[PDB]
């Protein structure tokens, strides 16, 4: 599948990962990831890396995405579309912490608050140490951290560039 590169440059004044996350947000908000364009990162060792890599099967051109990232052009670099027979596809993994599932136990099982604390008191509290990005969510008005990890390649992708199922 042919692919394109979006490398964050000159982001020292601002962290590199903040520019990476803003690249993800601007690629989300102006379309791009309809259902078939996916992201991958060549340098996840402990950081998310500074290269976004889009491996759309139909083909991503330079002009559409450089018009999309007109806001990041001061510290971005776009390579010409190259080809890759295999891309290392990542997916979204989310975390839950206490009250999250407590409200689930309010609205699914219909139990009271104290017994919902009782079934979950000694449980939960997982801690994801995977490399991540920090995403502005616009439909739900709060900003969060989204965790990415390696999984088998899927035909369909989300609106963010990660695998489905």
């Amino acid at each position: 599948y042919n692919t394109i590169s979006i490398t964050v440059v000159d982001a020292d004044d601002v962290g590199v990962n903040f520019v990476v996350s803003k690249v993800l947000s601007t690629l989300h908000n102006k379309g791009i990831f309809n259902g078939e364009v996916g992201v991958t990162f060549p340098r996840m060792d402990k950081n998310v890396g500074d290269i976004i890599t889009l491996f759309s099967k139909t083909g991503v051109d330079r002009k559409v995405l450089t018009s999309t990232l007109n806001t990041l052009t001061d510290f971005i670099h776009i390579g010409k579309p190259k080809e890759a027979d295999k891309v290392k596809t990542y997916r979204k993994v989310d975390t839950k912490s206490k009250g999250k599932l407590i409200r689930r136990c309010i609205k699914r099982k219909g139990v009271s608050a104290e017994t919902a604390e009782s079934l979950y008191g000694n449980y939960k509290g997982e801690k994801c140490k995977l490399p991540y990005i920090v995403v502005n969510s616009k439909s739900t008005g709060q900003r969060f951290s989204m965790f990415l990890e390696e999984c088998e390649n899927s035909e369909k992708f989300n609106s963010y560039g990660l695998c489905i199922v």
């Binding site: 590169s5 490398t7 060549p42 290269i51």
Partner: peptide
């Protein structure tokens, strides 16, 4: 650094 940028 620019030729390193385009070659990832």
């Amino acid at each position: 650094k620019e030729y390193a940028l385009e070659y990832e």
